[PDB]
Amino acid sequence: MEKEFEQIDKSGSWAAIYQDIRHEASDFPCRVAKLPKNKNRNRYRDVSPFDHSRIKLHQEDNDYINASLIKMEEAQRSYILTQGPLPNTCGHFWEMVWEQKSRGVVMLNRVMEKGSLKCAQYWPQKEEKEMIFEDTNLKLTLISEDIKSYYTVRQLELENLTTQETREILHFHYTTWPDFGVPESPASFLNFLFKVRESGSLSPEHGPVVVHCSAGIGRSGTFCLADTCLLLMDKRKDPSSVDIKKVLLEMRKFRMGLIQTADQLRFSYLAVIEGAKFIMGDSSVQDQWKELSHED
Numbered sequence: 499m500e501k502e503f504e505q506i507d508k509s510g511s512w513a514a515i516y517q518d519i520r521h522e523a524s525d526f527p528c529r530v531a532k533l534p535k536n537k538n539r540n541r542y543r544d545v546s547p548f549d550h551s552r553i554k555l556h557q558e559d560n561d562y563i564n565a566s567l568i569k570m571e572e573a574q575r576s577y578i579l580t581q582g583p584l585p586n587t588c589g590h591f592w593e594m595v596w597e598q599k600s601r602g603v604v605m606l607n608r609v610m611e612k613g614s615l616k617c618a619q620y621w622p623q624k625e626e627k628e629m630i631f632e633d634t635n636l637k638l639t640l641i642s643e644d645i646k647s648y649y650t651v652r653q654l655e656l657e658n659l660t661t662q663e664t665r666e667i668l669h670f671h672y673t674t675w676p677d678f679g680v681p682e683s684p685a686s687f688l689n690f691l692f693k694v695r696e697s698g699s700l701s702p703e704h705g706p707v708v709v710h711c712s713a714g715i716g717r718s719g720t721f722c723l724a725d726t727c728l729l730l731m732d733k734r735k736d737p738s739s740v741d742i743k744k745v746l747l748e749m750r751k752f753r754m755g756l757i758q759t760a761d762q763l764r765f766s767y768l769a770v771i772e773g774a775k776f777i778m779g780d781s782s783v784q785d786q787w788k789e790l791s792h793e794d
């Protein structure tokens with residue numbers, strides 16, 4: 499992929515490669531997302547979950563949520579990519595986290611971006627102001643948060659009011675990744691991803707991590723593509739066979755539009771090439787990424 503990257507850069511063909519991918523991308527029915535009754539459960543009329551991979555709420559009322567299960571078989575990791583919840587779907591969103599047994603939530607957007615609301619304020623900002631979602635009977639409380647220069651890690655307590663159970667949910671919020679944009683640098687991106695990895699949120703012992711931005715495809719796709727590619731090059735006899743474009747197409751079989759710009763695709767290569775340094779044997783890179791990320 500490194501020789502690929504150079505040749506692509508050299509030829510100034512990113513937009514061409516990326517466009518080929520959009521052309522080859524799977525096209526699956528999204529009937530349920532399109533039902534008349536779910537119009538208000540969709541943030542963007544053009545971003546919908548495929549029927550075969552959509553996450554189903556365990557409610558007879560209406561089991562719909564704009565969320566997709568990206569099940570990467572070879573990499574042995576699953577991710578749920580969903581849109582930034584709407585004012586009326588925050589209860590659904592947390593019902594999904596409970597039901598799917600997720601341990602962590604990765605937010606890659608801010609609620610307001612470029613003067614526009616891109617996602618509801620679905621978690622409490624103040625410990626004393628917990629949130630109650632009456633429709634799904636859940637309760638969410640902020641226990642503590644650890645704010646860094648470009649991301650914030652929150653410790654939340656989700657309580658299922660019906661069953662009296664409590665679970666700790668880790669919220670990993672990347673606050674400076676712009677819409678249709680790319681992280682500041684590969685190190686800052688990788689320092690964030692590895693933070694998520696180290697927390698244990700991505701382990702098979704837990705349900706799929708929930709990843710989202712505003713539409714749940716651009717930034718979310720980038721994050722997931724890099725993570726998956728890094729797992730692949732660590733599992734394969736030949737760490738060089740990993741084809742980023744092929745992996746992305748694999749992911750697009752579960753949710754549409756993953757990776758929204760040719761530059762986000764380029765950034766994914768950069769991110770994976772650098773991350774490979776850790777995969778291939780040198781753990782020191784991690785410590786180096788933290789320095790370059792300047793989280794303090």
Ligand SMILES: CC(=O)N[C@@H](Cc1ccccc1)C(=O)N[C@@H](Cc1ccc([C@@H]2CC(=O)NS2(=O)=O)cc1)C(N)=O
Binds near residue numbers: 543544
């Ligand atoms: C109101 C609305 O849905 N507007 C639609 C346009 C539309 C489509 C069909 C009919 C009428 C209007 C709309 O803006 N959709 C958005 C969908 C969309 C929103 C946000 C992104 C973001 C890009 C990124 O890097 N991260 S992300 O949160 O996935 C990516 C895609 C768009 N196309 O930009």
